[PDB]
Amino acid sequence: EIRPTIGQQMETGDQRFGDLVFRQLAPNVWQHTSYLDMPGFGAVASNGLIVRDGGRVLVVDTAWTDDQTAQILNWIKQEINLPVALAVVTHAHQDKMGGMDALHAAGIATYANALSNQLAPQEGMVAAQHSLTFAANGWVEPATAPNFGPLKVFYPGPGHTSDNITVGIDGTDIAFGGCLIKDSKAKSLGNLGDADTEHYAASARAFGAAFPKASMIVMSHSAPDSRAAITHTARMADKLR
Numbered sequence: 001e002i003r004p005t006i007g008q009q010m011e012t013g014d015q016r017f018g019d020l021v022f023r024q025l026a027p028n029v030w031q032h033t034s035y036l037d038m039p040g041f042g043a044v045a046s047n048g049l050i051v052r053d054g055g056r057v058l059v060v061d062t063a064w065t066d067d068q069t070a071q072i073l074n075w076i077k078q079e080i081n082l083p084v085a086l087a088v089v090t091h092a093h094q095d096k097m098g099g100m101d102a103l104h105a106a107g108i109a110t111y112a113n114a115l116s117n118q119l120a121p122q123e124g125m126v127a128a129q130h131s132l133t134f135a136a137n138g139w140v141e142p143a144t145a146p147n148f149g150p151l152k153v154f155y156p157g158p159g160h161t162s163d164n165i166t167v168g169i170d171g172t173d174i175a176f177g178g179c180l181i182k183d184s185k186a187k188s189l190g191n192l193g194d195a196d197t198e199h200y201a202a203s204a205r206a207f208g209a210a211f212p213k214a215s216m217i218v219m220s221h222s223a224p225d226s227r228a229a230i231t232h233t234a235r236m237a238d239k240l241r
């Protein structure tokens, strides 16, 4: 059993598949978890989502690596056996975009914030093949997110990074904060090296206001939590100003 140094542990309702862990969150939503083995430190878990939308599947975030991301695709093939229409990746760091080449090799259409695509080559990442753009209030421009089904993409403002985006799952009470949101018991906001410490608090609160009726908040490095993940993250971020 993988026991990560950073990230949630395995509990009841988790399926180990190869090097990854999968957890069903709703009838049509699963969390994927992959692990970066840091020598002398141990495993760092990172989470994304898999959403079934009728006869097709949608993915939020890659795993840390191409091979792990190919394992996500293998899990989808075994457990769902429907084609992946597209993936949305939530900023230009390894935990979220490290596996782009596996998605591209599989022929899956990839989407990211235009700014993530512009930053990708500066972050040792491969850009997504399509760029999302956003309104002044953070909502994605719908012409840039064709046929996204239940994925409702929201740019909350700079926080964990300047490019971080978030995703609500319409038809459910789930919203995904990626690395912007930390859980209600977290002591740290994680890596602030690329963060906007001035705007972080407002960006965390904007995510909450964008999906005001989401009761299950999914994030990169903890198990799904209540809305207290949002409010606690914002309270920690208030201390940065």
Ligand SMILES: CC1(C)S[C@H]([C@H](NC(=O)[C@H](N)c2ccccc2)C(=O)O)N[C@H]1C(=O)O
Pocket: 006, 036, 038, 044, 093, 094, 095, 096, 179, 189, 190, 191, 192, 220, 221
């Ligand atoms: C879990 C992290 C502290 S590391 C991860 C990310 N870092 C990477 O993906 C790096 N490539 C990395 C380098 C060394 C060890 C682990 C990750 C970041 O900088 O936001 N997201 C951070 C976070 O979400 O706070």
Ligand SMILES: [Zn+2]
Pocket: 091, 092, 093, 160, 161, 179
């Ligand atoms: Zn990051």
Ligand SMILES: [Zn+2]
Pocket: 095, 179, 220, 221
């Ligand atoms: Zn992260």
